[PDB]
Design a protein around this ligand. Sequence first.
Ligand code: HEM
Ligand code: HEM
Ligand SMILES: C[C@H](O)[C@H](O)[C@H]1CNc2nc(N)[nH]c(=O)c2N1
Ligand SMILES: C[C@H](O)[C@H](O)[C@H]1CNc2nc(N)[nH]c(=O)c2N1
Ligand SMILES: C[C@H]1CN=C(N)c2sccc2O1
Ligand SMILES: C[C@H]1CN=C(N)c2sccc2O1
Lengths: 421, 421
Amino acid sequence: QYVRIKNWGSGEILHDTLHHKATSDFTCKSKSCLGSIMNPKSLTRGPRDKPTPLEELLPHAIEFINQYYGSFKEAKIEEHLARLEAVTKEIETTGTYQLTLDELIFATKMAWRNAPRCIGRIQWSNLQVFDARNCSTAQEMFQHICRHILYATNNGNIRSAITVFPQRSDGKHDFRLWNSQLIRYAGYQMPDGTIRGDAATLEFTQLCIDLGWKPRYGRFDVLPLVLQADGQDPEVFEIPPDLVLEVTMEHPKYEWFQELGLKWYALPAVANMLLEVGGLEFPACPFNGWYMGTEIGVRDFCDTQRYNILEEVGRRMGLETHTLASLWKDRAVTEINVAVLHSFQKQNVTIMDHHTASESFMKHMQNEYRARGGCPADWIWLVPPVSGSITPVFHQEMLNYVLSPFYYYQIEPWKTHIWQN
Amino acid sequence: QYVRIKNWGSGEILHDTLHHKATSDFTCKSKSCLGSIMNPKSLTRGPRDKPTPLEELLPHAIEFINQYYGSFKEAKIEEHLARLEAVTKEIETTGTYQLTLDELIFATKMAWRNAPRCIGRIQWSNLQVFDARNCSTAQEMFQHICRHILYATNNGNIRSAITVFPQRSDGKHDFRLWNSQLIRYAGYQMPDGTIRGDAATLEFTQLCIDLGWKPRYGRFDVLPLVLQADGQDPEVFEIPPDLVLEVTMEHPKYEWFQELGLKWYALPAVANMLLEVGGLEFPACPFNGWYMGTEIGVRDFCDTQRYNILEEVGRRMGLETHTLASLWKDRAVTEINVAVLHSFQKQNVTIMDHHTASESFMKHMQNEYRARGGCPADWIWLVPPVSGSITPVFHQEMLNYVLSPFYYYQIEPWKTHIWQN
Ligand code: HEM
Ligand code: HEM
Ligand SMILES: C[C@H](O)[C@H](O)[C@H]1CNc2nc(N)[nH]c(=O)c2N1
Ligand SMILES: C[C@H](O)[C@H](O)[C@H]1CNc2nc(N)[nH]c(=O)c2N1
Ligand SMILES: C[C@H]1CN=C(N)c2sccc2O1
Ligand SMILES: C[C@H]1CN=C(N)c2sccc2O1
């Protein structure tokens, strides 16, 4: 009937029934739980080489159409009925179908709404949609992407948006962005064995170089867009610097913080995910929202596998960086977090601290259960990387399941791509 | 063959094969993951009212005996063979069997070793075992428990230990401790609607009162032991104050911290879990290790559902406690954590900071894969309540599964108990 969920901080109880609409199997076994696996197959939608079998499509298509028309406050049965037939006939005549712009907008917001790992979902209905399903070349992709970046950046007053390119037809003509995020920094393997820049993009950086991109060997060099159109080999494109807004890091008290010469891009945009909707798959649909402080101040700056700046900030604070039990790491990471938030605020760039985001998510989840008795949520991703139990999200039991529409991961394109030259 | 596991901080890869020895089903469904549910049925072993069917026992018994004898560095086949027969004959003749003291010690350490939610498992082989399987009355239980508390406290130089009482025979004569932990503080519902003390023990406190315990209405009143022997109604017993070691909270800089009049018990001991081993179940086996700072400084003191002292510490620090985005909560919780660690250190009471515990666990897991290619681990419990990604445990993917021996939870005794008077 329903799974009981409790919030140990408040004692509140919730009944989850939405999980019944869950698609096929998830990650965890029957006698084993994964949960903490970053890229499980349950969240990945791979490549094809043949259209989607009609027996599978039509059911999903009908299903989606029913969900779409069901969403209206005042039903439109004829329109619904009409759409149902038109869709069917279209599938019979073309072996696939096209969504109406409104259905697409609906699909993008719902898929966002269904992202178990997104803590900013209270904003789900507030999303701008750029329809690029007519795109056909790498150059056109590049223009669309630039328009997106410009619209979304909005001189610091960030706006959430998504650009949808042509849906996968037969899997042999996929539109794909080879980047992780639209704007990412390069990571170089220096001569003296050290790593410069974002160690996380090392392989992809090399790939950009192996494709003719000129490495500037900086600590913060914006990587180029590596676009793939209609299944063809990817083409490299530098992002016009005017479009990339950055925030210089300053601490509100430690004047020496700037001496660290740190900065970060203001636009967080996922570039390589696939949008699944009504039997259709969109291998290219870069989207963006805005940053939550800890992503930058904690992960990007303090992960040892990233810019790893924690110890240095410790020393400059004159802490016992050689005695773990002194909790210096705890002292440092906080100042860095304050730096990030301070810097974004002073430069008028949208950002949200993790405490506020958590409360926001709790209100959202709360609304979701009333609205549809459920909210797919991955505790492991929703709980901020610092101050865990200090946030309300930590005390909330959650159910993680994959609905549809959905945003899946994809096999790295360079691992399955059939090159031409 | 094996599940691949990656540590994103180091890049290291591990192959888990131990999960194959997993018992029956776990929590997560096939198309849904729980993971974040505190008390799932997969971790609970309920009450019975009839002996364990022999078809189920013998197999488990043989299994355990094989694991035990297999653990020796130099095999003792005859002894193994002999034990196998003796065990069998014992089951045939009595419908159950008794473990040798050595097998029991082995079982308690292995079950600890198999606790997915324990971050201090590197200490697993270092455990003192008090054999109370001969106990028969509440008073005897009380003596054993007192001996345990005294041995374990060791004037602040904490020692891990466990006391095992009679195994469940037919489920109608269970030995059970009704407390959560051996030493826990009382929680009272005051006249003026406020809550005093540990809000988490409110119900159990009332229960102690409904059983004749005299409420001292303090903020830190040690609850009484509510012992149940051989299936009889529980009897109340106050713990001799001499046995309860406490640490007064002092901050190494904020002299006003003491003015908060805070303190905590030095002995963390789980009182209500069940030890499952070779088909046998021990409904009473209180055990203890030592504290990890964050349990006290973050959970006990800062959980809103506990002593909820965060805002007050904020104010005394003169922080913008009305602006979440100021990260004041982050500033406060750190000082409290330093207080706890400082206080335990100055009073010579064993304690481990969370950063050190995490590294320790990583070394342990690392050893476990070499030793037996696996380590059941519940990411959600192993990652400290603060400084998440600052700890190595955060970047470690993990597999959570239930082996045997194991420590299960149990239905609250007062919900299934058949009273007599
Ligand atoms: C408006 C503000 C938004 C905020 C503050 C927000 C915040 C976040 C954060 C903190 C993460 C964690 C990222 C990481 O640790 O790697 C995340 C993940 C995610 N967000 Fe949101 N988000 C927002 C908008 C959006 C939008 C507009 C979409 C889609 C239309 C979206 C889709 C997702 C998805 C699918 C993930 C998972 C990414 C992955 O698995 O790598 N988010 N979000
Ligand atoms: C020697 C030091 C030890 C340390 C520092 C340690 C630390 C911890 C911590 C921090 C937790 C989390 C508790 C919570 O958040 O509620 C935990 C849980 C646990 N520990 Fe360990 N532990 C130690 C020894 C032991 C021993 C000796 C046993 C058993 C023989 C054990 C069994 C467990 C179990 C079963 C849990 C789960 C408790 C639950 O689910 O409520 N631990 N431990
Ligand atoms: C192993 C771990 O699953 C990965 O380390 C986790 C935890 N949660 C995360 N949470 C977010 N929000 N983003 C993340 O990168 C990761 N990684
Ligand atoms: C919902 C959540 O499962 C409970 O809040 C969690 C997370 N992890 C925990 N981790 C530990 N170590 N002890 C805990 O109490 C809890 N509770
Ligand atoms: C960097 C990456 C993850 N963090 C975010 N805030 C978001 S929200 C949408 C996209 C996105 O991109
Ligand atoms: C309070 C409870 C949980 N925290 C601990 N450190 C441990 S370790 C063994 C028992 C125990 O008791």
